[PDB]
Amino acid sequence: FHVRVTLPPRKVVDRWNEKRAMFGVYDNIGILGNFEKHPKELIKGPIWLRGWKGNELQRCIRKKRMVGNRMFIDDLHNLNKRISYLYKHFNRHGKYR
Amino acid sequence: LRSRVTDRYWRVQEVLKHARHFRGRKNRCYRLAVRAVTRAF
Amino acid sequence: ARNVLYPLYQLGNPQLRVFRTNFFIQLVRPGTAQPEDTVQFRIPMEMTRVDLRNYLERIYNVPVAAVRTRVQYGSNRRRDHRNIRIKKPDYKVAYVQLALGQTFTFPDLFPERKGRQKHSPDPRRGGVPGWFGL
Amino acid sequence: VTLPPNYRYGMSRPGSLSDKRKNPPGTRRRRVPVEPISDEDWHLFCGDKVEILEGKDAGKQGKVVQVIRQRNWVVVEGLNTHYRYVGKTVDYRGTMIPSEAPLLHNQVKLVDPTDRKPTDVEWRFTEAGERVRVSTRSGRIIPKPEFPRADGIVPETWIDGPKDTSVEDALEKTYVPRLKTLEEEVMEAMGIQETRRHKKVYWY
Amino acid sequence: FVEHARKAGLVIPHERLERPIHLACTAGIFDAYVPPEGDARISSLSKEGLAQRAERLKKNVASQLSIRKIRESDPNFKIKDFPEKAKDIFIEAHLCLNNSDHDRLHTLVTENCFPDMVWDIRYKTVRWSFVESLEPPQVVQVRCSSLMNQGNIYGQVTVRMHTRQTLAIYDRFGRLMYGQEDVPRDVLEYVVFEKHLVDPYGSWRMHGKIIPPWAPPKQPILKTVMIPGPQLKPWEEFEEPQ
Amino acid sequence: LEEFFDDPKNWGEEKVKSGASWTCQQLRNKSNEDLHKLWYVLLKERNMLLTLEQEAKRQRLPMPSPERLEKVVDSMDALDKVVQEREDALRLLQTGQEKARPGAWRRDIFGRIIWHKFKQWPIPWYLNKKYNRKRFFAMPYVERFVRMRIEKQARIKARKRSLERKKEKFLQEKFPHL
Amino acid sequence: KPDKLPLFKRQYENTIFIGSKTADPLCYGHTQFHLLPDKLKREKLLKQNCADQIEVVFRANAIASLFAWTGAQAMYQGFWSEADVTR
Amino acid sequence: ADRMSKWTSKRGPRTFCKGRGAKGTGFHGRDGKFVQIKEMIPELVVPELAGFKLKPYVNYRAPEGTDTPLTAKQLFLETAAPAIEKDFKAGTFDPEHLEKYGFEPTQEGKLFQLYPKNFPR
Amino acid sequence: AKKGFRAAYRFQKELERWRLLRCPPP
RNA sequence: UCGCACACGCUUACAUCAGUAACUAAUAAUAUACUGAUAAUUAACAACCAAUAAACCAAAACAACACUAAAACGUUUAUUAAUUACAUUGUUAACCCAACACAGGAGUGCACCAAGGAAAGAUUAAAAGAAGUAAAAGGAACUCGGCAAACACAAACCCCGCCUG
RNA sequence: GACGAGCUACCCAUGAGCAGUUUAAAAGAACCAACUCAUCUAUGUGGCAAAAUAGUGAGAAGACUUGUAGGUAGAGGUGAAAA
RNA sequence: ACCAAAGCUAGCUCAACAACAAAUACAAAAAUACACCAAAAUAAAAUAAAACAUUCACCUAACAUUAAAGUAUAGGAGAUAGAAAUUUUUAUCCUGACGCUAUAGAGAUAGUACCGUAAGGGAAAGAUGAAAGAAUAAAAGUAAAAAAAAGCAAA
Ligand SMILES: [Mg+2]
Ligand SMILES: [Mg+2]
Ligand SMILES: [Mg+2]
Ligand SMILES: [Mg+2]
Ligand SMILES: [Mg+2]
Ligand SMILES: [Mg+2]
Ligand SMILES: [Mg+2]
Ligand SMILES: [Mg+2]
Ligand SMILES: [Mg+2]
Ligand SMILES: [Mg+2]
Ligand SMILES: [Mg+2]
Ligand SMILES: [Mg+2]
Ligand SMILES: [Mg+2]
Ligand SMILES: [Mg+2]
Ligand SMILES: [Mg+2]
Ligand SMILES: [Mg+2]
Ligand SMILES: [Mg+2]
Ligand SMILES: [Mg+2]
Ligand SMILES: [Mg+2]
Ligand SMILES: [Mg+2]
Ligand SMILES: [Mg+2]
Ligand SMILES: [Mg+2]
Ligand SMILES: [Mg+2]
Ligand SMILES: [Mg+2]
Ligand SMILES: [Mg+2]
Ligand SMILES: [Mg+2]
Ligand SMILES: [Mg+2]
Ligand SMILES: [Mg+2]
Ligand SMILES: [Mg+2]
Ligand SMILES: [Mg+2]
Ligand SMILES: [Mg+2]
Ligand SMILES: [Mg+2]
Ligand SMILES: [Mg+2]
Ligand SMILES: [Mg+2]
Ligand SMILES: [Mg+2]
Ligand SMILES: [Mg+2]
Ligand SMILES: [Mg+2]
Ligand SMILES: [Mg+2]
Ligand SMILES: [Mg+2]
Ligand SMILES: [Mg+2]
Ligand SMILES: [Mg+2]
Ligand SMILES: [Mg+2]
Ligand SMILES: [Mg+2]
């Protein structure tokens, strides 16, 4: 439980730096902009996760069905295995049945 | 976001206040101390 | 030469010559008592007896009577800070002997020719810093 | 030159006793952040007078002995100073010597010869194919510090021994640019005569 | 101990160190003037001493050769001003060892001087006082040294000075060791100052402190001290000289 | 036989000086016969330096004037540079094969594509035992490992990049330039 | 040490033999004849840059064989290193 | 068991014999006696050094030079070009036989051939 | 390296509390 | 009183000089095992070291001659065999396999010492435990059983397997 | 699905050992060493040892011991059956 | 007072975009002699069905995405399995991080030591400062300070 003896340099953060000032800027783009582009397109991320949501099982099964054949051998394997495990666990376990 | 308990130190010390005057190994080691302190209160 | 491809010999083939020879040599003071007629060489691994002979005769004009060759094994024992082994490299030794009765001796290479302050504290000072007058 | 991936420079040469003693084979210490400087943006050589903008000794001017590019340091002789003992034995602490603490290149600016002021060096290309250091403040060209070498040998004062080739012989061009190799050449000019030819060989 | 085992440990390989070691000072004091053995009795007569000093200054060829190289190398230089600055460098040096401020103590005193006056004293309490200079500071001689390697010239000005000082050295436990603070003792110091010439910062420094041969034995120390005879092994017999 | 030692006059002396190593250029000027000689004039010297060295070791004495050895070495090395040079261009002009040894790109059992250095045999290859039992080709299953290799390799690049990128953030936040 | 000759140590049964067992009526050698092996031909020696050796090769041989030849005889007569020799 | 250390003639049994990489000079004989071929022993070709001036080192103040690695083309210019323009200007140029300029059609005639590379060094 | 300032800082108060027990101030 | 050598197997643990406060030794002293520097075993012993036809029914066993289980081993004739100093390689050890500097596992030839080696760090002289020697009278009364031990080392009868394995 | 017969079981090549005594006998005969097994007891039980030590024991020219080197592989091998 | 304790870096995670040269398959790293070479046959079971016999998604393939739809269907018609027609989809640009901070993060300072005859398994450890070309005293455990008729140790 021995704890840090010397004060760290206080991290100074300008909340006024570019990215933070400009946060959430185009959020209303569809509405204010006579909808053409959806808020979705403001999402920069992993191919299969854009404008979508799900629990682990759905995520995984999705990554598979989308990028599956572009994955490395080993990751792929671990993915199929995680899938199986999850199948078994969500369907076949719980308190609530 | 891996998060840990920094302050575990005080958590212990707040028990150990009361464990000071005990005889034996009861007055330091947190396990034994806890129990002793319960019986005491 | 060494590390070189040598041309396959078959019958009626031209004599093989090597114009710039790749080998090298060391003349070393024998660790042991030996007869005067003998001189000792550390040579590279790929060097045959006949080779050391010809090499010696031709480049240095030394009259070789005979040659022996043995291989000293370098220690694989000593360990690195990671406990990987260190290897002192294995090397080939060759003893030579001189033709006309020439007696050799290894030259001593180092003839030895070249080209007080007591600040200890005063016993009777008692440790006082004597730099100070008064 | 012998170096591990994580290394620390103590002013001491990589191949030395003091270097094996400071950072032995089994130490890797914390990284030292060093502002990246491309070799072409580096304005400091050894031997030029530079004003030191920082330290207990500041505003002063000194000559540059040696540069450590790796950790980005300069060395001004006997200017930045701390005191160390060299001679040591049981009864004797001998020889207190002034030694130079190295300086980062943020604390040192190049001094232009004319007005002996500090300046901002800037690399420029003139009209002759030349690359020189021009002052932001003074608008001059600053020289480069032509210096001795680690040998101690000045070429102008020299005498050739037994095994030294004189300037003359070495610049002598004996070359005859023709289609023969060293081998045909040297056998031909040694007078060695050969007749028989190699049998057909196969190659896989 | 001077010892080297050449049987195993080889020889530390001979290096060319990329930076030639840069010395502000040279340890040696080249030529030591040895004062007259009657300088105690000639110190009560003002115009005897002052006359002999000024005379031996003007008369010496070496002295004025050296003051010539100093003057020709360093403009705005005067020998009649110097014993003033010199007597000042002292009162700054010792006042430094009182307070134990070593940062100023480097600016004043030389490379050879520092290790000595600082060393053996550094764990004790030093309290020293300057009251009278009975005879104003006298410049004895000047010596230049030519290093043909560096072109570096080292001027050394010798100042013989008479003084009145009160020194009290306490040991690290708070108890007195050497001498009272209440005795303004009379001292005769033969002092040596040094300057580097080619140096652009041209500092004037205290180099060394020399004691003449007949100089008075110093104050008796307080604590008794034991000088041991030689340590004997069992079979070695002792022998007593007459 | 003393050709393995310095002039007896030089033995007990610490610093024994000597000249510079040979620039490539300085050698480019010599004819072929004379490089051929310089090989040996350098050779004998090399052997002396080696000898002197080993003895310095044996004697618990630091070796007099070390750099000699470095220097000779380079020149030997340098001489070599010029010799192959003069063959290498030559054959390019005559033959035009950039490689002096026959050889071919081949594919070994481990799915690596290798540069096969050739060899000399008294007989044709289809009459050769040992050659014929070497297999240059990939079998079917190996194709799996091939991919893994790629992938394995592909990660290392992948996370090398990702490290260097990081080193640029850190510095730029440690050193606010401009 | 003789090893530098070269010479080699190899141990096995140590025999003292005259060419005939002790039982023989002929205890005494007259002469021997040693034909020289092929290695030791003259020509080979002059090829090897070996001059005087041609003579020495002979010498050596005698000093060996003859010695043994003699010694055997002595040993056969009951003589040895501590009985020395009468005749 | 030692996995890591290399396999040498010194580790195995009697029967295991592996040369350290010296080159083979011969073949086995009839009697079992070993046979050497005078033509398989490398013969060093050494000039007389006494007659000439060259040294293992050079003067320090002696100049370095502009560094030009030799290119095929430079060579072609020094040797082949002058003679070539000489005989095209004369008009006696014969693109058919280039042998007078030093070109060799195929290498199997000559002693040291470049491409199969007959010679050690 | 993202730590508790809470940890360090709160610890400092102990540190000085002990500084106050081992040398009580004048 | 397990000695010398070789094969196998080990790899520098061998050699010389210097060091050991600590690290190896289950302690020390000092050093064949810890440290460093420097050296070193040299081929005549050993490894490498021809084919294709053709005659030959007939054992080794001190081999006279036989035994029954029918027994490994090469001579010569002919056909060609690059012909030519010196090829290459192994040669240290107190050693190996058992996690150990293990009372154990380790093939062959010679030896029974001419070789190798030490059972006890220093005392004391309790109980209990281990190994050994001796014991009056008695002689299996012990005990599942004469197990163990013995100045004994003999006879007999049974059940079950036939037998050596 | 790979990996293992360097232990051990069984072969297959290929080497090597068995002294003295008794016997008309080299007879799966006797006596008794080396050698090979492992009866019975006591030690030993984090041992010297993950099966040993000391005594004591059976075999000891044979279905004998043993060296090096190959061979059979798990749904299988191998076995004078004890799974 | 010992033993100890603290540093913030080494790198990692997820995601976007797109040193020749010799020698090496003789017992690998041994230049050189007469041959042979090469080849293929469904994945299975653990497990679900509360047992187990038919059956038990993913496990190979590419095909994505929004739907049609958990529908048509197939199923010891149980467990579960599960389509298509037909529909949807705007450019690049604009990289990072409500990811880890030395038991975490990769096994990794390395597939290294070490462990296996082998396939195979498989570690642990870094920290002073510009400069060593300058020599907190807070875990258990102990020590400073051995114990005095009585007994969940405290109240
Ligand atoms: Mg979830
Ligand atoms: Mg040889
Ligand atoms: Mg040999
Ligand atoms: Mg292994
Ligand atoms: Mg072998
Ligand atoms: Mg062997
Ligand atoms: Mg052997
Ligand atoms: Mg955090
Ligand atoms: Mg071992
Ligand atoms: Mg010890
Ligand atoms: Mg031996
Ligand atoms: Mg005892
Ligand atoms: Mg007893
Ligand atoms: Mg008893
Ligand atoms: Mg009795
Ligand atoms: Mg009874
Ligand atoms: Mg009874
Ligand atoms: Mg009964
Ligand atoms: Mg009994
Ligand atoms: Mg008895
Ligand atoms: Mg019955
Ligand atoms: Mg039976
Ligand atoms: Mg029997
Ligand atoms: Mg077997
Ligand atoms: Mg018998
Ligand atoms: Mg029998
Ligand atoms: Mg007994
Ligand atoms: Mg019996
Ligand atoms: Mg019987
Ligand atoms: Mg096998
Ligand atoms: Mg198998
Ligand atoms: Mg059986
Ligand atoms: Mg049964
Ligand atoms: Mg049963
Ligand atoms: Mg390789
Ligand atoms: Mg089943
Ligand atoms: Mg089930
Ligand atoms: Mg269930
Ligand atoms: Mg299935
Ligand atoms: Mg990016
Ligand atoms: Mg880790
Ligand atoms: Mg504590
Ligand atoms: Mg009570």
The answer to whether residues F76 and F35 touch, using CB atoms and an 8 Å cutoff, is: no
Chain A residues in contact with I4 by the CB 8 A cut-off are 4
Report the C-alpha gap between A46 and A30 in whole angstroms: 22
Question: SS3 for E67?
Answer: helix
Specify the DSSP element, H or E, that contains C40. strand C38-43
Report the C-alpha gap between C51 and C57 in whole angstroms: 10
User: What tokens does E166 get?
Assistant: 């009160």
User: What tokens does C105 get?
Assistant: 């001796």
The answer to whether residues F38 and F21 touch, using CB atoms and an 8 Å cutoff, is: no
Report the C-alpha gap between I17 and I24 in whole angstroms: 10
Q: Between chains, do H59 and F19 touch, taking CB under 8 Å as contact?
A: yes
Q: Domain total for chain E?
A: 1
Quote the ligand 19 centre to F23 CA distance (angstroms). 99
Nucleotide L14 C1' to residue A46 CA (A): 10
Q: Between chains, do G49 and C35 touch, taking CB under 8 Å as contact?
A: no
Question: SS3 for D194?
Answer: coil
The answer to whether residues C70 and H45 touch, using CB atoms and an 8 Å cutoff, is: no
CA–chain centroid gap for E118, Å, is 12
Q: Between chains, do F25 and H66 touch, taking CB under 8 Å as contact?
A: yes
Q: How far apart are the first and last CA of chain H?
A: 42
| Closest ligand to the CA of H11 | 5
The answer to whether residues D117 and D138 touch, using CB atoms and an 8 Å cutoff, is: yes
Tokens 């025999």 sit on residue: G15
Distance of CA D13 to CAs D22, D23, D26, H114, Å?
11, 12, 18, 47
Residue E171 lies in a domain: yes
Q: Between chains, do H57 and D164 touch, taking CB under 8 Å as contact?
A: yes
The answer to whether residues F56 and F11 touch, using CB atoms and an 8 Å cutoff, is: no
Q: Before E184, cis peptide (omega within 30)? A: no
Instruction: Kindly state whether D177 is in contact with chain H, defined as any CB-CB distance less than 8 angstroms.
Output: yes
Report the C-alpha gap between E183 and C134 in whole angstroms: 10
The answer to whether residues E45 and E53 touch, using CB atoms and an 8 Å cutoff, is: no
Q: In chain A, where are the structural domains located?
A: 1-97
User: What tokens does G41 get?
Assistant: 């031909």
Amino acid identity at F43: L
Q: Is the CB of H28 under 7 A from strand J?
A: yes
- Chain C residues 62-91 within 7 Å (CB) of strand J: 66-78, 88
Decide: H and D in contact? Rule: 3+ Cβ pairs under 8 Å: yes
The answer to whether residues A84 and A61 touch, using CB atoms and an 8 Å cutoff, is: no
Select the residue from F7, F27, F31 to test the D interface by mutation, using most D Cβ atoms within 10 A.
F31
The answer to whether residues H52 and F41 touch, using CB atoms and an 8 Å cutoff, is: no
Nearest one of E38, E61, E214 to E143, comparing CA atoms = E61
Tokens 């083979």 sit on residue: H24
What's the farthest any 2 CA atoms get from each other in chain H? 79
Nearest one of C14, C131, D37, F93 to E118, comparing CA atoms = C131
Decide: H and F in contact? Rule: 3+ Cβ pairs under 8 Å: yes
Residue A27 region by backbone torsions, left for phi larger than 0, else alpha for psi between -120 and 50, else beta: alpha
Report the C-alpha gap between F137 and F116 in whole angstroms: 13
Q: How far is H58 from chain D (nearest CA, A)?
A: 4
CA–chain centroid gap for E47, Å, is 27
Report the C-alpha gap between D162 and C62 in whole angstroms: 24
Report the C-alpha gap between A13 and D142 in whole angstroms: 42
Question: SS3 for A87?
Answer: helix
Report the C-alpha gap between D131 and D126 in whole angstroms: 7
Report the C-alpha gap between D142 and D45 in whole angstroms: 12
Distance of CA H44 to CAs C24, D137, E42, E134, Å?
13, 68, 93, 93
DSSP E190: E
User: What tokens does C127 get?
Assistant: 């440790």
Pairing of strands D164-165, H57-58: parallel
Report the C-alpha gap between E197 and E206 in whole angstroms: 15
Residues pairing with G50 in the sheet = none
A·B CB contacts under 8 A:
7
Residue F92 neighbours by CB under 8 Å, 6+ apart:
F98, H72
Q: How far is H85 from chain F (nearest CA, A)?
A: 18
Report the C-alpha gap between F166 and F159 in whole angstroms: 11
- CA angle, corner C101, sides to C96 and C104, nearest 5? 60
Positive/negative CA dihedral, C99, C103, C106, C109: negative
Nearest one of A89, A43, A50 to A66, comparing CA atoms = A50
Instruction: Kindly state whether A9 is in contact with chain I, defined as any CB-CB distance less than 8 angstroms.
Output: no
Report the C-alpha gap between C85 and C78 in whole angstroms: 6
DSSP F137: S
Q: Between chains, do D66 and E18 touch, taking CB under 8 Å as contact?
A: yes
Report the C-alpha gap between B13 and I17 in whole angstroms: 15
Amino acid identity at A14: D
Q: Between chains, do I8 and A10 touch, taking CB under 8 Å as contact?
A: no
User: What tokens does I5 get?
Assistant: 């300032």
For helices A73-92 and A56-67, angle between their N-to-C axes, nearest 10 degrees: 150
Distance of CA G6 to CAs C66, C68, C95, E153, F165, Å?
12, 9, 11, 71, 69
The answer to whether residues D173 and F29 touch, using CB atoms and an 8 Å cutoff, is: yes
Residue E203 lies in a domain: yes
Tokens 């009160």 sit on residue: E166
Other residues' Cβ atoms within 10 Å of the Cβ of residue D182: 24
User: What tokens does C64 get?
Assistant: 């070789």
DSSP F126: G
Chain D residues in contact with E106 by the CB 8 A cut-off are 83
Q: Which nucleotides of L are covered by protein (CB under 7 A)?
A: 5-17, 20-40, 47-48, 57-59, 62-66, 80, 90-91, 94-102, 104, 109-110, 112-114, 116-118, 123-124, 126-141, 152-155
Q: How many CA atoms lie within 13 A of G44 on its CB side?
A: 8
Q: Between chains, do H118 and C7 touch, taking CB under 8 Å as contact?
A: yes
User: What tokens does G25 get?
Assistant: 């009526």
Report the C-alpha gap between F144 and G16 in whole angstroms: 74
The answer to whether residues D118 and D110 touch, using CB atoms and an 8 Å cutoff, is: yes
Q: Which nucleotide is nearest to C66 (CA to C1')?
A: J86
Pairing of strands C64-72, C38-43: unpaired
Burial, G2: exposed, middle or buried (Cβ in 10 Å; 0-12, 13-18, 19+)? exposed
Q: Is the CB of H72 under 7 A from strand J?
A: no
Chain A residue whose CA is closest to B10: A1
Q: How far is D63 from chain C (nearest CA, A)?
A: 34
User: What tokens does D170 get?
Assistant: 């070495």
Nearest one of E167, E224, E231, E229 to C124, comparing CA atoms = E224
Tokens 């042991």 sit on residue: C32
Q: What are φ and ψ of residue C92, in 5° steps?
A: -95, 130
Distance of CA E83 to CAs D64, E139, E145, E205, Å?
36, 6, 21, 13
Nearest one of D72, D54, D74 to D64, comparing CA atoms = D74
Q: Between chains, do D83 and E16 touch, taking CB under 8 Å as contact?
A: no
Report the C-alpha gap between H38 and H41 in whole angstroms: 6
Q: Name the residue among C10, C13, C19 with its Cβ closest to that of D186.
A: C19
Length of chain F: 178
Residue G45 neighbours by CB under 8 Å, 6+ apart:
G51, G53, G54, G57
Report the C-alpha gap between A56 and A51 in whole angstroms: 16
Pairing of strands D141-142, D131-135: antiparallel
User: What tokens does F169 get?
Assistant: 């953030």
Report the C-alpha gap between B17 and F38 in whole angstroms: 89
Distance of CA G42 to CAs G50, G60, H29, H31, H117, Å?
9, 15, 22, 21, 41
Query: Chain E residues contacting D, CB < 8 Å?
Result: 1-2, 12, 15-16, 18-19, 21-24, 27, 103, 106, 111-112, 114-115, 119, 200-201
The answer to whether residues A40 and A50 touch, using CB atoms and an 8 Å cutoff, is: yes
- CA angle, corner E85, sides to E80 and E90, nearest 5? 135
Report the C-alpha gap between D51 and E218 in whole angstroms: 49
Report the C-alpha gap between A83 and A89 in whole angstroms: 10
Nearest one of B32, B31, B33 to B16, comparing CA atoms = B33
The answer to whether residues C43 and C23 touch, using CB atoms and an 8 Å cutoff, is: yes
Pairing of strands H43-44, C17-18: parallel
Q: How far is H41 from chain C (nearest CA, A)?
A: 7
Nucleotide J36 C1' to residue D20 CA (A): 17
Report the C-alpha gap between C42 and D197 in whole angstroms: 36
Q: Name the residue among D17, D61, D99 with its Cβ closest to that of E12.
A: D17
The answer to whether residues D113 and D144 touch, using CB atoms and an 8 Å cutoff, is: no
Decide: C and E in contact? Rule: 3+ Cβ pairs under 8 Å: yes
Q: Is the CB of H40 under 7 A from strand J?
A: no
The answer to whether residues D185 and F104 touch, using CB atoms and an 8 Å cutoff, is: no
Report the C-alpha gap between D94 and E9 in whole angstroms: 24
Other residues' Cβ atoms within 10 Å of the Cβ of residue D113: 10
List, in sequence order, every beta strand (DSSP E) within chain E: 125-132, 138-146, 153-170, 185-196, 204-210
CA quadruple G50, G55, G59, G60: dihedral, nearest 10: 10
Q: In chain D, where are the structural domains located?
A: 1-146
Helices (H) and strands (E) in chain E, counts: 5, 5
Q: Between chains, do H116 and F102 touch, taking CB under 8 Å as contact?
A: yes
User: What tokens does E104 get?
Assistant: 């100023």
List, in sequence order, every beta strand (DSSP E) within D42-170: 49-52, 61-63, 73-74, 82-89, 92-99, 103-104, 108-111, 118-119, 121-125, 131-135, 141-142, 164-165
- Chain H residues 4-43 within 7 Å (CB) of strand L: 4, 6-8, 12-13, 15-25, 40
Burial, B36: exposed, middle or buried (Cβ in 10 Å; 0-12, 13-18, 19+)? buried
Give the structural domain span for E170: 35-222
Select the residue from I9, I18, I19 to test the A interface by mutation, using most A Cβ atoms within 10 A.
I9
Residue E237 lies in a domain: no
Q: Which nucleotide is nearest to H41 (CA to C1')?
A: J87
Gyration radius of chain I's alpha carbons: 12
Range F142-166 burial, b when 16+ CB lie within 10 A, else e: eeeeeeeeeeeeeeeeeeeeeeeee
Q: How far is H53 from chain C (nearest CA, A)?
A: 18
Report the C-alpha gap between C132 and E129 in whole angstroms: 12
Nucleotide L75 C1' to residue A51 CA (A): 37
Question: SS3 for C70?
Answer: strand
Q: What is the resolution of this structure in A?
A: 3.8
Q: Name the residue among E7, E8, E11 with its Cβ closest to that of F62.
A: E11
Q: Which residue is nearest to nucleotide L99 (CA to C1')?
A: B1
Q: Which nucleotide is nearest to G13 (CA to C1')?
A: J110
Partner chains of B (3+ C-beta pairs under 8 Å): A, I
Report the C-alpha gap between F125 and F132 in whole angstroms: 7
Distance of CA E80 to CAs D51, D139, E35, H20, Å?
35, 47, 20, 86
User: What tokens does E73 get?
Assistant: 């190398």
Q: How far apart are the first and last CA of chain A?
A: 42
Chain A residues in contact with I15 by the CB 8 A cut-off are 5
Helices (H) and strands (E) in chain A, counts: 4, 0
Decide: C and A in contact? Rule: 3+ Cβ pairs under 8 Å: no
Q: Is the CB of C82 under 7 A from strand L?
A: yes
Q: Between chains, do D16 and E16 touch, taking CB under 8 Å as contact?
A: no
The answer to whether residues E177 and C130 touch, using CB atoms and an 8 Å cutoff, is: no
Nearest one of D173, C63, C62, D147 to F28, comparing CA atoms = D173
User: What tokens does H20 get?
Assistant: 């350290």
Report the C-alpha gap between B33 and F13 in whole angstroms: 78
Specify the DSSP element, H or E, that contains H28. strand H26-28
CATH 3.40.50.1460 fits C1-134, yes or no: no
Residue E29 lies in a domain: no
For helices F32-58 and C49-60, angle between their N-to-C axes, nearest 10 degrees: 110
